[PDB]
Amino acid sequence: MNPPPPETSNPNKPKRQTNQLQYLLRVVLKTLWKHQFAWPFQQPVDAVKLNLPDYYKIIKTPMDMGTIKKRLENNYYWNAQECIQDFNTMFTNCYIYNKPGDDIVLMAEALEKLFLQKINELPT
Ligand SMILES: CC(=O)Nc1cc(Nc2ccccn2)c2cccc(O)c2n1
Numbered sequence: 001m002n003p004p005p006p007e008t009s010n011p012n013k014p015k016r017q018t019n020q021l022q023y024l025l026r027v028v029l030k031t032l033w034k035h036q037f038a039w040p041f042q043q044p045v046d047a048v049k050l051n052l053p054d055y056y057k058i059i060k061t062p063m064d065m066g067t068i069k070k071r072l073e074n075n076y077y078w079n080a081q082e083c084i085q086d087f088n089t090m091f092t093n094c095y096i097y098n099k100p101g102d103d104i105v106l107m108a109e110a111l112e113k114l115f116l117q118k119i120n121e122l123p124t
Pocket residue numbers: 040041045050052093094095097098104
């Protein structure tokens with residue numbers, strides 16, 4: 001079945017709220033959330049509902065925009081680079097599990113190119 005989702009709070013992890021992390025929630029995430037290809041990434045992969053029983057045998061660092069959202073809302077991150085790593089992990093997983101030109105990869109590559117032009121400039 002499905003593994004536990006990644007943690008969205010951790011009381012012994014130091015937390016911070018920088019200007020660039022506010023921008024990742026308020027601006028970067030909340031617009032990517034609205035893209036037409038955003039739905040498969042708005043929650044952890046449900047390997048049971050999707051009949052992908054091999055997903056979590058291949059992917060061992062799962063990540064998804066729904067986890068990132070709760071992490072941003074809970075001030076989980078020390079800095080913006082930690083949150084950007086989570087985004088890249090989400091995109092990289094999708095390219096590892098699937099193959100060039102799959103419908104899901106096209107969705108991810110569309111989000112990823114949008115993600116890059118949106119983080120091109122972060123606040124100060
Ligand atoms: C062969 C295959 O179904 N691959 C998939 C399917 C996903 N979500 C879905 C969900 C519903 C229908 C089809 N697809 C998916 C999601 C996130 C990351 C991934 O790597 C994914 N890979």
